[PDB]
Amino acid sequence: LKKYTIDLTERAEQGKLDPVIGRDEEIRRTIQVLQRRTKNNPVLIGEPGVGKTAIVEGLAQRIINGEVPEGLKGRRVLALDMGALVAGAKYRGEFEERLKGVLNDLAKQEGNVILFIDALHTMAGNMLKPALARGELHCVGATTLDEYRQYIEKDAALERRFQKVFVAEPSVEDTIAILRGLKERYELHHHVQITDPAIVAAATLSHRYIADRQLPDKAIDLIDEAASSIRMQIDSKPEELDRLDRRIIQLKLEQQALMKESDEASKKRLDMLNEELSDKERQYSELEEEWKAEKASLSGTQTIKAELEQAKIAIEQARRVGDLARMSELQYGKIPELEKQLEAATQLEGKTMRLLRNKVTDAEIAEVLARWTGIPVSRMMESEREKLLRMEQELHHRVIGQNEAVDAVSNAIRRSRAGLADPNRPIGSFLFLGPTGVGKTELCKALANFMFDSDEAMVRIDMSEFMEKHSVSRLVGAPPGYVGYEEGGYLTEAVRRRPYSVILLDAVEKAHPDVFNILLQVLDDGRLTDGQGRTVDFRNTVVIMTSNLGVRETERKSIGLIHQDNSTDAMEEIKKIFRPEFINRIDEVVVFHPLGEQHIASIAQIQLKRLYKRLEERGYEIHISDEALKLLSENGYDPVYGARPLKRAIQQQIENPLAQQILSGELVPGKVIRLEVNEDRIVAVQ
Amino acid sequence: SFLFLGPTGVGKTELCKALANFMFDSDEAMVRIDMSEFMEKHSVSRLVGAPPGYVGYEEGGYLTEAVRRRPYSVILLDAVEKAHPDVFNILLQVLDDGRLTDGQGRTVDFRNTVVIMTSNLGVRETERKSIGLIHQDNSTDAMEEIKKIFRPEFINRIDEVVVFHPLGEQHIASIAQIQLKRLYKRLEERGYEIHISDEALKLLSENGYDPVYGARPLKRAIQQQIENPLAQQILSGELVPGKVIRLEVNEDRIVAVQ
Amino acid sequence: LKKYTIDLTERAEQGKLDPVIGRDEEIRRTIQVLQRRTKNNPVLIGEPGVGKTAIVEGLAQRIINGEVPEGLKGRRVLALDMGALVAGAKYRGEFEERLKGVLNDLAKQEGNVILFIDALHTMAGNMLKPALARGELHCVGATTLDEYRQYIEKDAALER
Amino acid sequence: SSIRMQIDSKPEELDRLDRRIIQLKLEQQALMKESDEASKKRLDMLNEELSDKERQYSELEEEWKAE
Ligand SMILES: Nc1ncnc2c1ncn2[C@@H]1O[C@H](COP(=O)(O)OP(=O)(O)OP(O)(O)=S)[C@@H](O)[C@H]1O
Ligand SMILES: Nc1ncnc2c1ncn2[C@@H]1O[C@H](COP(=O)(O)OP(=O)(O)OP(O)(O)=S)[C@@H](O)[C@H]1O
Ligand SMILES: Nc1ncnc2c1ncn2[C@@H]1O[C@H](COP(=O)(O)OP(=O)(O)OP(O)(O)=S)[C@@H](O)[C@H]1O
Ligand SMILES: Nc1ncnc2c1ncn2[C@@H]1O[C@H](COP(=O)(O)OP(=O)(O)OP(O)(O)=S)[C@@H](O)[C@H]1O
């Protein structure tokens, strides 16, 4: 006991531990395990962070407070580790005799002292089971499920001496009370305020968006992180002081470099920069002056906070000794007087200046969790309003036509930023049923290039690969008994990388209806469980389907066949598999339409922009006759095909004599090329 | 052991979640499993675990794991057309006797745990055959796909075969005013309130209805009709918090007004 | 420390280390996670092409240049060798006899060091969990993506 | 073991009445402390409720002792 153990009760006696609120039936349950005749030793099972070690802690706190039931009053709790154990036993019999010696140390401890084991699934086996049988080994363990089972579930005393107690992830409100317990502890370490919408929004959004770590733990390190952020901000200077300090240090290192001169006053023709340099000195004294003012304010605030807690630990040690009149004149007396005038003074300090930031606040929490996912609230103060309010203009840079479609998509993303969508659904559930040659993939690339500013994050998946049973085994993963079980799937791993992004599907109809049903999982609800064995949240990505159910009837429907009927044999495979919650609870069947003249001329222009971009990389510039654009616009159109073979007319009419002459060396860089229809076709000229 | 058949329109797993929030006070504990994952041969190696010596053995299948953790729960089964007949017969060891072994080497109790199967064999044909199909005849063409694998051991050893039915329009009014409430929670998130006329709510009633499609154009008819201009006026900075919105109808498209 | 580990800050002071350009939000993010009171243990994830141990050594460059915010300027950084610890694994029992004494030395510098760990999926382990639990051991890890996937993602203390 | 706990623990009339008397002792500790004795020492109702709950608490206390 000299070497191997740590008294928890004494570290409680220094108040080093932190209080734990609740779980009362768990505590009575465990004490019921403790003062039994046999099976004296309980098991705590759950997830990590749920508070198993902290349940042991607050138990020991209740013991040193004397609030324990009788018999246990005075009985001590010590935690035994490994690591002091596993010292230099290179030869046989050493470690065994250590453990035997501390078992006899327990024997002369006469049943008084409760032992604790953390990480029961570490640990012998022979040496404990009779002492376990007698009840002499009076211990407590803690682990998770799989560590328990795969440790072993099935050793005779190692199940027989022990009893399982489920902790579980508690409610929102319980964790709220926990944060109400620990908020003062973290104002001690973290020197700032605590706002109530910060903690209730922290519990709510941590419950919504983090899908791996549990309450309370995710709210806890939300608080620890954000308070760390505010100390990080206040510890440094504000960025106006920093960049304005950069021009201050820039100019004083400019003349500081320029003091070493032949005749310094002669080459000081820059006398106004000497004067304005003294202005940087004075202005710097202003910024540092307000800076030390704010440091005096919040520094004094941190002192009276910590000294206030010294009054509180003082009054609790006074609760241990019980001198009621002194306690009543202190906590009913001198301390809350200085508290309320102290808060009037510190709110006067909070309103006396502006660069001070003392609250937590909930918006900071929204920025942190927003940084883990990608959905902020803080763009509202930012210049989101421009690019959001020209979202139709932004997409109508690189997609002409179909205003209905871009308005539909745009309104969906706008109400996603509003927060109006069902949290228990995916955001976007889209179906584009239009003709060919219309720029579906243009729209998808436009949107990925809108948010994530590339066409990387757009997760393209062909569905024409898929006909058979094995298709879902492709995208989802393999069952166990196969190497692909160790591997996993495309999709599950893919959104498990980055949560909230774009998922793209192409010619969706050809697959099996099994595909469509697991779509109906992730579109009715937005969850899917992999073959590996874990649920995957989809509920804040956007899925997009452009396809060809309707297309072989879309090419004959326009105009004259009704959108109900191509909605119907489009709805052939659909109502074959999908139900009213799908079609009524997807976003839209989006219809497209063919193009006219200025469509084709416009996409000729923005098509040419990339050509000017690449030749602009190569040092060439091109001027084009309007008539050449007229002939190309004459060439590109065909009704059955739409916008596509315009590109063919571009490359074969333009690019081939251009390629011949550009490798001919006739064309010299720096001299801007001109394009003339000095033919029946387009010719090139310098 | 209940099977849920007929048309849909109705929120079958919504009723399941009503039980999950009923007795377990949340929809978390209600373990849900798709059958349309499970059409393969290899599906059993997903749900029950692996045979010895191979990849995935010492980890087990999460069904027996979840039941063996907390014994007496509610197990959700879904869209049962798409499964495999062995899973039907492993399931026949479920409904008979309430016990089931794994690949790992032991059995798991079921005998105080409810299994619920939402399925579509009705709504695969009943919303098509809306004239003349009775509960017995729906059991017959149910027993087209059903009768081969599912036998009177299966079909007798399920408890009750609950058929459903389409929706009254006042029901749809009830669902709509249900769906308003969480939107009012979104308003109390931001400090707002919607008033509505009776008549604009009547517009949502006359728009949301579809006989074949049940009530289910309701919510997307709602937020598609009203939340898009709402999101415009909010994201504009136009709409001030601390105020009341009324759903007026400047004309037959519903408009939100401060 | 002295027995096994290597001072990176000393190498930056001797100019042996390479500068980096940009990424101020990420190194600020790391500082932000280092100002935790507990679990104060950030992990870098990416390919080896993304150069993250260059990021931590350029962080050490910022520390020596004092452009780190305050409080950390008293601290110094060392990186851990696995091999000189683990190479004496002849019998069953000897490695932890080294490792616990190492942990006591970390308890002897008393929070004035900031530990770096590389190849976190290689990193024993049960003894690490309490010191990382309390936030006593103030360490920094960095590793690869599917190394973290075959680490185990649902491994109990280690996610936490 | 559990019924032995419920015996050895303090009973529910004893502990509920203990909470009510201890709230009445802390409220009494704030009420005997006067800012205006002629105003704050109007407290007669709190002190007769004090003696009342000392009667009830003391009697159930004594019955608990005898059992
Ligand atoms: N109810 C609670 N009240 C206060 N703090 C809590 C509570 N639950 C969890 N915590 C915190 O969560 C931390 C981790 O939980 P533990 O007590 O270690 O139990 P755990 O679930 O075994 O986690 P481990 O030790 O990683 S397996 C504790 O140290 C507390 O700081
Ligand atoms: N409105 C448009 N704006 C710009 N380019 C367009 C437009 N319509 C078609 N295109 C061009 O046509 C090409 C093919 O269109 P896509 O973007 O692939 O969509 P699509 O017409 O439906 O054909 P898919 O993708 O095979 S279904 C694009 O790469 C563009 O070069
Ligand atoms: N009659 C109804 N009453 C209440 N909610 C309903 C009703 N009909 C549909 N819903 C809603 O519809 C959504 C999904 O209902 P579900 O429970 O999935 O119906 P379902 O029959 O289970 O469909 P599946 O899962 O494709 S078999 C939820 O938001 C329900 O609240
Ligand atoms: N922004 C950068 N600045 C400087 N060097 C960089 C940068 N990005 C990558 N590198 C270099 O990338 C190389 C490999 O990456 P490392 O920094 O060693 O860490 P890494 O990502 O783990 O790759 P490893 O070490 O091979 S596993 C190093 O030589 C770095 O110097």
PDB file of N, CA and C in Angstrom, chain A residues 145 149-150 154 166 385 411 414-415 419-423 469 472 479-482 485 514 517-518 521 525 529 571 577 579-581 584-585 587-588, chain B residues 8 28 32 34 36-37 39-40 42 45-46 55-56 58 65 68-69 82 106 120 123-124 186 212-213 216-220 223-224 227-228 232 235:
ATOM      1  N   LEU A 145     -18.062  -2.614 -23.210  1.00  0.00           N
ATOM      2  CA  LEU A 145     -18.676  -3.905 -23.490  1.00  0.00           C
ATOM      3  C   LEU A 145     -17.699  -4.863 -24.162  1.00  0.00           C
ATOM      4  N   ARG A 149     -16.170  -8.482 -22.931  1.00  0.00           N
ATOM      5  CA  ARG A 149     -16.380  -9.769 -23.580  1.00  0.00           C
ATOM      6  C   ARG A 149     -15.083 -10.327 -24.136  1.00  0.00           C
ATOM      7  N   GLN A 150     -14.406  -9.546 -24.979  1.00  0.00           N
ATOM      8  CA  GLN A 150     -13.184 -10.008 -25.619  1.00  0.00           C
ATOM      9  C   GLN A 150     -12.033 -10.077 -24.638  1.00  0.00           C
ATOM     10  N   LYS A 154     -16.169 -15.045 -19.872  1.00  0.00           N
ATOM     11  CA  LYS A 154     -16.586 -16.399 -19.516  1.00  0.00           C
ATOM     12  C   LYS A 154     -15.731 -17.135 -18.492  1.00  0.00           C
ATOM     13  N   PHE A 166     -25.480  -1.110 -15.915  1.00  0.00           N
ATOM     14  CA  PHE A 166     -25.492  -0.261 -17.100  1.00  0.00           C
ATOM     15  C   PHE A 166     -25.517   1.191 -16.674  1.00  0.00           C
ATOM     16  N   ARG A 385     -24.286  37.590 -48.051  1.00  0.00           N
ATOM     17  CA  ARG A 385     -25.512  38.122 -48.638  1.00  0.00           C
ATOM     18  C   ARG A 385     -25.332  38.407 -50.111  1.00  0.00           C
ATOM     19  N   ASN A 411     -33.283  27.782 -53.660  1.00  0.00           N
ATOM     20  CA  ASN A 411     -34.181  27.912 -52.518  1.00  0.00           C
ATOM     21  C   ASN A 411     -33.978  26.786 -51.525  1.00  0.00           C
ATOM     22  N   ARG A 414     -30.867  27.718 -49.616  1.00  0.00           N
ATOM     23  CA  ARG A 414     -31.145  28.888 -48.793  1.00  0.00           C
ATOM     24  C   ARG A 414     -31.919  28.504 -47.545  1.00  0.00           C
ATOM     25  N   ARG A 415     -32.909  27.622 -47.680  1.00  0.00           N
ATOM     26  CA  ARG A 415     -33.616  27.216 -46.476  1.00  0.00           C
ATOM     27  C   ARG A 415     -32.802  26.230 -45.667  1.00  0.00           C
ATOM     28  N   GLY A 419     -32.092  26.968 -41.556  1.00  0.00           N
ATOM     29  CA  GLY A 419     -32.363  26.039 -40.483  1.00  0.00           C
ATOM     30  C   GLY A 419     -33.782  25.534 -40.438  1.00  0.00           C
ATOM     31  N   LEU A 420     -34.515  25.622 -41.546  1.00  0.00           N
ATOM     32  CA  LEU A 420     -35.931  25.287 -41.547  1.00  0.00           C
ATOM     33  C   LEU A 420     -36.191  23.831 -41.889  1.00  0.00           C
ATOM     34  N   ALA A 421     -35.197  23.121 -42.415  1.00  0.00           N
ATOM     35  CA  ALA A 421     -35.346  21.733 -42.836  1.00  0.00           C
ATOM     36  C   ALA A 421     -35.537  20.826 -41.629  1.00  0.00           C
ATOM     37  N   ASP A 422     -36.107  19.659 -41.882  1.00  0.00           N
ATOM     38  CA  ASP A 422     -36.155  18.644 -40.853  1.00  0.00           C
ATOM     39  C   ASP A 422     -34.739  18.208 -40.521  1.00  0.00           C
ATOM     40  N   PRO A 423     -34.341  18.301 -39.265  1.00  0.00           N
ATOM     41  CA  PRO A 423     -33.092  17.665 -38.853  1.00  0.00           C
ATOM     42  C   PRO A 423     -33.115  16.158 -39.028  1.00  0.00           C
ATOM     43  N   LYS A 469     -27.224  -8.170 -58.307  1.00  0.00           N
ATOM     44  CA  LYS A 469     -27.118  -8.257 -56.858  1.00  0.00           C
ATOM     45  C   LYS A 469     -25.865  -7.567 -56.326  1.00  0.00           C
ATOM     46  N   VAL A 472     -24.830  -3.377 -54.750  1.00  0.00           N
ATOM     47  CA  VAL A 472     -24.867  -2.833 -53.406  1.00  0.00           C
ATOM     48  C   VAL A 472     -23.669  -3.321 -52.613  1.00  0.00           C
ATOM     49  N   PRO A 479     -20.136  -8.113 -46.411  1.00  0.00           N
ATOM     50  CA  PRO A 479     -20.345  -8.810 -45.153  1.00  0.00           C
ATOM     51  C   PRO A 479     -19.083  -9.511 -44.678  1.00  0.00           C
ATOM     52  N   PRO A 480     -19.010  -9.869 -43.388  1.00  0.00           N
ATOM     53  CA  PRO A 480     -17.879 -10.650 -42.873  1.00  0.00           C
ATOM     54  C   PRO A 480     -17.721 -12.012 -43.524  1.00  0.00           C
ATOM     55  N   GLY A 481     -16.515 -12.557 -43.395  1.00  0.00           N
ATOM     56  CA  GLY A 481     -16.136 -13.708 -44.161  1.00  0.00           C
ATOM     57  C   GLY A 481     -15.637 -13.369 -45.538  1.00  0.00           C
ATOM     58  N   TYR A 482     -15.018 -12.208 -45.706  1.00  0.00           N
ATOM     59  CA  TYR A 482     -14.520 -11.732 -46.983  1.00  0.00           C
ATOM     60  C   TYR A 482     -13.540 -10.586 -46.751  1.00  0.00           C
ATOM     61  N   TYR A 485     -15.065  -7.067 -46.370  1.00  0.00           N
ATOM     62  CA  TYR A 485     -15.506  -6.688 -45.037  1.00  0.00           C
ATOM     63  C   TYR A 485     -14.442  -5.896 -44.313  1.00  0.00           C
ATOM     64  N   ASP A 514     -33.190  -2.963 -54.994  1.00  0.00           N
ATOM     65  CA  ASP A 514     -32.479  -2.953 -53.714  1.00  0.00           C
ATOM     66  C   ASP A 514     -31.725  -1.653 -53.496  1.00  0.00           C
ATOM     67  N   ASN A 517     -34.180   0.928 -52.555  1.00  0.00           N
ATOM     68  CA  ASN A 517     -34.721   0.867 -51.211  1.00  0.00           C
ATOM     69  C   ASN A 517     -33.758   1.456 -50.199  1.00  0.00           C
ATOM     70  N   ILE A 518     -32.460   1.240 -50.389  1.00  0.00           N
ATOM     71  CA  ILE A 518     -31.532   1.825 -49.436  1.00  0.00           C
ATOM     72  C   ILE A 518     -31.406   3.321 -49.693  1.00  0.00           C
ATOM     73  N   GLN A 521     -34.156   4.419 -47.494  1.00  0.00           N
ATOM     74  CA  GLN A 521     -33.609   4.665 -46.165  1.00  0.00           C
ATOM     75  C   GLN A 521     -33.029   6.055 -46.079  1.00  0.00           C
ATOM     76  N   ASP A 525     -35.199   8.816 -44.115  1.00  0.00           N
ATOM     77  CA  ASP A 525     -34.565   9.178 -42.861  1.00  0.00           C
ATOM     78  C   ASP A 525     -33.235   9.872 -43.052  1.00  0.00           C
ATOM     79  N   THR A 529     -26.743   1.836 -42.341  1.00  0.00           N
ATOM     80  CA  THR A 529     -25.797   1.020 -41.606  1.00  0.00           C
ATOM     81  C   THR A 529     -24.973   0.241 -42.611  1.00  0.00           C
ATOM     82  N   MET A 571     -42.422   7.090 -63.433  1.00  0.00           N
ATOM     83  CA  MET A 571     -42.908   6.524 -62.184  1.00  0.00           C
ATOM     84  C   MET A 571     -43.138   5.019 -62.316  1.00  0.00           C
ATOM     85  N   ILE A 577     -40.869   0.663 -57.109  1.00  0.00           N
ATOM     86  CA  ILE A 577     -40.181   0.473 -55.844  1.00  0.00           C
ATOM     87  C   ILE A 577     -40.543   1.516 -54.779  1.00  0.00           C
ATOM     88  N   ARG A 579     -42.611   4.846 -52.927  1.00  0.00           N
ATOM     89  CA  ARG A 579     -43.903   4.907 -52.298  1.00  0.00           C
ATOM     90  C   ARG A 579     -44.199   6.406 -52.199  1.00  0.00           C
ATOM     91  N   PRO A 580     -45.373   6.833 -51.714  1.00  0.00           N
ATOM     92  CA  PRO A 580     -45.622   8.280 -51.562  1.00  0.00           C
ATOM     93  C   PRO A 580     -44.669   9.064 -50.668  1.00  0.00           C
ATOM     94  N   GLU A 581     -44.032   8.458 -49.659  1.00  0.00           N
ATOM     95  CA  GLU A 581     -43.053   9.211 -48.871  1.00  0.00           C
ATOM     96  C   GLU A 581     -41.822   9.555 -49.694  1.00  0.00           C
ATOM     97  N   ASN A 584     -43.295  12.179 -52.748  1.00  0.00           N
ATOM     98  CA  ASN A 584     -43.813  13.359 -52.087  1.00  0.00           C
ATOM     99  C   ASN A 584     -42.793  13.963 -51.141  1.00  0.00           C
ATOM    100  N   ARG A 585     -41.788  13.185 -50.715  1.00  0.00           N
ATOM    101  CA  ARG A 585     -40.820  13.717 -49.767  1.00  0.00           C
ATOM    102  C   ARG A 585     -39.406  13.790 -50.349  1.00  0.00           C
ATOM    103  N   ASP A 587     -37.383  16.188 -53.182  1.00  0.00           N
ATOM    104  CA  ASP A 587     -37.631  17.577 -53.505  1.00  0.00           C
ATOM    105  C   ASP A 587     -38.435  17.706 -54.787  1.00  0.00           C
ATOM    106  N   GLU A 588     -37.831  17.386 -55.926  1.00  0.00           N
ATOM    107  CA  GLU A 588     -38.527  17.588 -57.188  1.00  0.00           C
ATOM    108  C   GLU A 588     -38.116  16.627 -58.275  1.00  0.00           C
TER     109      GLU A 588
ATOM    110  N   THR B   8     -49.915   2.432 -47.863  1.00  0.00           N
ATOM    111  CA  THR B   8     -49.283   3.302 -46.894  1.00  0.00           C
ATOM    112  C   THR B   8     -49.787   4.714 -47.143  1.00  0.00           C
ATOM    113  N   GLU B  28     -33.937   6.289 -30.012  1.00  0.00           N
ATOM    114  CA  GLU B  28     -32.602   5.732 -30.150  1.00  0.00           C
ATOM    115  C   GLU B  28     -32.602   4.225 -29.985  1.00  0.00           C
ATOM    116  N   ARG B  32     -33.208  -0.605 -35.615  1.00  0.00           N
ATOM    117  CA  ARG B  32     -33.852  -0.782 -36.898  1.00  0.00           C
ATOM    118  C   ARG B  32     -32.908  -1.512 -37.836  1.00  0.00           C
ATOM    119  N   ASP B  34     -32.784  -2.900 -42.002  1.00  0.00           N
ATOM    120  CA  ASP B  34     -33.332  -3.034 -43.344  1.00  0.00           C
ATOM    121  C   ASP B  34     -33.322  -4.502 -43.742  1.00  0.00           C
ATOM    122  N   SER B  36     -33.717  -4.852 -47.209  1.00  0.00           N
ATOM    123  CA  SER B  36     -33.248  -4.706 -48.576  1.00  0.00           C
ATOM    124  C   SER B  36     -31.746  -4.655 -48.667  1.00  0.00           C
ATOM    125  N   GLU B  37     -31.066  -4.428 -47.552  1.00  0.00           N
ATOM    126  CA  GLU B  37     -29.672  -4.815 -47.513  1.00  0.00           C
ATOM    127  C   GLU B  37     -29.533  -6.310 -47.713  1.00  0.00           C
ATOM    128  N   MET B  39     -30.509  -9.183 -49.224  1.00  0.00           N
ATOM    129  CA  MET B  39     -31.005 -10.125 -50.225  1.00  0.00           C
ATOM    130  C   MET B  39     -29.963 -11.199 -50.546  1.00  0.00           C
ATOM    131  N   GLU B  40     -28.728 -10.993 -50.140  1.00  0.00           N
ATOM    132  CA  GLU B  40     -27.622 -11.834 -50.563  1.00  0.00           C
ATOM    133  C   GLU B  40     -27.571 -13.136 -49.793  1.00  0.00           C
ATOM    134  N   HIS B  42     -24.749 -13.466 -48.384  1.00  0.00           N
ATOM    135  CA  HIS B  42     -23.723 -13.115 -47.416  1.00  0.00           C
ATOM    136  C   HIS B  42     -24.333 -12.268 -46.293  1.00  0.00           C
ATOM    137  N   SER B  45     -24.088 -13.342 -42.793  1.00  0.00           N
ATOM    138  CA  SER B  45     -22.803 -13.065 -42.182  1.00  0.00           C
ATOM    139  C   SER B  45     -22.723 -11.613 -41.754  1.00  0.00           C
ATOM    140  N   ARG B  46     -23.532 -10.743 -42.369  1.00  0.00           N
ATOM    141  CA  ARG B  46     -23.725  -9.443 -41.729  1.00  0.00           C
ATOM    142  C   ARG B  46     -24.436  -9.570 -40.389  1.00  0.00           C
ATOM    143  N   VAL B  55     -12.665 -14.027 -41.412  1.00  0.00           N
ATOM    144  CA  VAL B  55     -12.678 -12.610 -41.253  1.00  0.00           C
ATOM    145  C   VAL B  55     -14.016 -12.183 -40.680  1.00  0.00           C
ATOM    146  N   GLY B  56     -13.955 -11.574 -39.505  1.00  0.00           N
ATOM    147  CA  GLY B  56     -15.138 -11.095 -38.832  1.00  0.00           C
ATOM    148  C   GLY B  56     -15.657 -11.981 -37.727  1.00  0.00           C
ATOM    149  N   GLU B  58     -14.545 -12.854 -34.392  1.00  0.00           N
ATOM    150  CA  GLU B  58     -14.608 -12.538 -32.969  1.00  0.00           C
ATOM    151  C   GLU B  58     -15.352 -11.240 -32.693  1.00  0.00           C
ATOM    152  N   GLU B  65     -25.663  -9.145 -30.572  1.00  0.00           N
ATOM    153  CA  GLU B  65     -24.942  -8.290 -29.648  1.00  0.00           C
ATOM    154  C   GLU B  65     -25.867  -7.317 -28.948  1.00  0.00           C
ATOM    155  N   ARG B  68     -28.219  -9.083 -26.701  1.00  0.00           N
ATOM    156  CA  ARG B  68     -27.551  -9.691 -25.560  1.00  0.00           C
ATOM    157  C   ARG B  68     -27.035  -8.628 -24.594  1.00  0.00           C
ATOM    158  N   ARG B  69     -26.886  -7.386 -25.055  1.00  0.00           N
ATOM    159  CA  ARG B  69     -26.595  -6.315 -24.108  1.00  0.00           C
ATOM    160  C   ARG B  69     -27.809  -5.995 -23.262  1.00  0.00           C
ATOM    161  N   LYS B  82     -37.578  -7.728 -49.630  1.00  0.00           N
ATOM    162  CA  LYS B  82     -36.323  -7.786 -50.340  1.00  0.00           C
ATOM    163  C   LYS B  82     -35.309  -8.664 -49.653  1.00  0.00           C
ATOM    164  N   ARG B 106     -23.027 -19.502 -28.873  1.00  0.00           N
ATOM    165  CA  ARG B 106     -24.015 -19.533 -27.803  1.00  0.00           C
ATOM    166  C   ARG B 106     -25.336 -18.996 -28.319  1.00  0.00           C
ATOM    167  N   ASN B 120     -44.749  -4.051 -47.411  1.00  0.00           N
ATOM    168  CA  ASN B 120     -45.268  -3.310 -48.536  1.00  0.00           C
ATOM    169  C   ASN B 120     -45.992  -4.190 -49.524  1.00  0.00           C
ATOM    170  N   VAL B 123     -49.006  -2.588 -50.301  1.00  0.00           N
ATOM    171  CA  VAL B 123     -48.874  -1.347 -51.069  1.00  0.00           C
ATOM    172  C   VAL B 123     -48.089  -1.593 -52.360  1.00  0.00           C
ATOM    173  N   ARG B 124     -47.512  -2.788 -52.514  1.00  0.00           N
ATOM    174  CA  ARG B 124     -47.067  -3.203 -53.839  1.00  0.00           C
ATOM    175  C   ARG B 124     -48.242  -3.436 -54.787  1.00  0.00           C
ATOM    176  N   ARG B 186     -38.799  25.956 -34.258  1.00  0.00           N
ATOM    177  CA  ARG B 186     -37.790  26.672 -35.028  1.00  0.00           C
ATOM    178  C   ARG B 186     -37.964  28.173 -34.865  1.00  0.00           C
ATOM    179  N   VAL B 212     -54.050   8.491 -54.175  1.00  0.00           N
ATOM    180  CA  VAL B 212     -53.071   7.421 -54.294  1.00  0.00           C
ATOM    181  C   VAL B 212     -51.935   7.722 -53.341  1.00  0.00           C
ATOM    182  N   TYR B 213     -51.550   8.985 -53.291  1.00  0.00           N
ATOM    183  CA  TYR B 213     -50.373   9.337 -52.532  1.00  0.00           C
ATOM    184  C   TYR B 213     -50.680   9.692 -51.095  1.00  0.00           C
ATOM    185  N   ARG B 216     -49.376  12.332 -47.914  1.00  0.00           N
ATOM    186  CA  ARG B 216     -47.940  12.570 -47.940  1.00  0.00           C
ATOM    187  C   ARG B 216     -47.408  13.713 -48.811  1.00  0.00           C
ATOM    188  N   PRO B 217     -48.127  14.330 -49.763  1.00  0.00           N
ATOM    189  CA  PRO B 217     -47.648  15.640 -50.252  1.00  0.00           C
ATOM    190  C   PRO B 217     -47.702  16.784 -49.226  1.00  0.00           C
ATOM    191  N   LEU B 218     -48.059  16.508 -47.966  1.00  0.00           N
ATOM    192  CA  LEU B 218     -48.339  17.540 -46.975  1.00  0.00           C
ATOM    193  C   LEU B 218     -47.128  18.411 -46.690  1.00  0.00           C
ATOM    194  N   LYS B 219     -46.085  17.842 -46.078  1.00  0.00           N
ATOM    195  CA  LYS B 219     -44.994  18.650 -45.530  1.00  0.00           C
ATOM    196  C   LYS B 219     -44.191  19.332 -46.624  1.00  0.00           C
ATOM    197  N   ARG B 220     -43.969  18.639 -47.730  1.00  0.00           N
ATOM    198  CA  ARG B 220     -43.187  19.269 -48.777  1.00  0.00           C
ATOM    199  C   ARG B 220     -44.034  20.243 -49.565  1.00  0.00           C
ATOM    200  N   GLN B 223     -43.574  23.326 -46.897  1.00  0.00           N
ATOM    201  CA  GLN B 223     -42.350  24.109 -46.822  1.00  0.00           C
ATOM    202  C   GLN B 223     -41.899  24.522 -48.207  1.00  0.00           C
ATOM    203  N   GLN B 224     -42.356  23.785 -49.214  1.00  0.00           N
ATOM    204  CA  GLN B 224     -42.134  24.205 -50.580  1.00  0.00           C
ATOM    205  C   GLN B 224     -43.005  25.404 -50.918  1.00  0.00           C
ATOM    206  N   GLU B 227     -42.068  28.016 -47.084  1.00  0.00           N
ATOM    207  CA  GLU B 227     -40.806  28.261 -46.399  1.00  0.00           C
ATOM    208  C   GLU B 227     -39.768  28.860 -47.314  1.00  0.00           C
ATOM    209  N   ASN B 228     -39.931  28.682 -48.612  1.00  0.00           N
ATOM    210  CA  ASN B 228     -39.025  29.333 -49.548  1.00  0.00           C
ATOM    211  C   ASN B 228     -39.132  30.857 -49.489  1.00  0.00           C
ATOM    212  N   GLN B 232     -36.358  33.493 -47.876  1.00  0.00           N
ATOM    213  CA  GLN B 232     -35.894  34.701 -48.555  1.00  0.00           C
ATOM    214  C   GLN B 232     -35.995  35.912 -47.643  1.00  0.00           C
ATOM    215  N   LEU B 235     -33.444  35.551 -44.688  1.00  0.00           N
ATOM    216  CA  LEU B 235     -32.037  35.688 -45.036  1.00  0.00           C
ATOM    217  C   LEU B 235     -31.753  37.050 -45.647  1.00  0.00           C
TER     218      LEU B 235
END
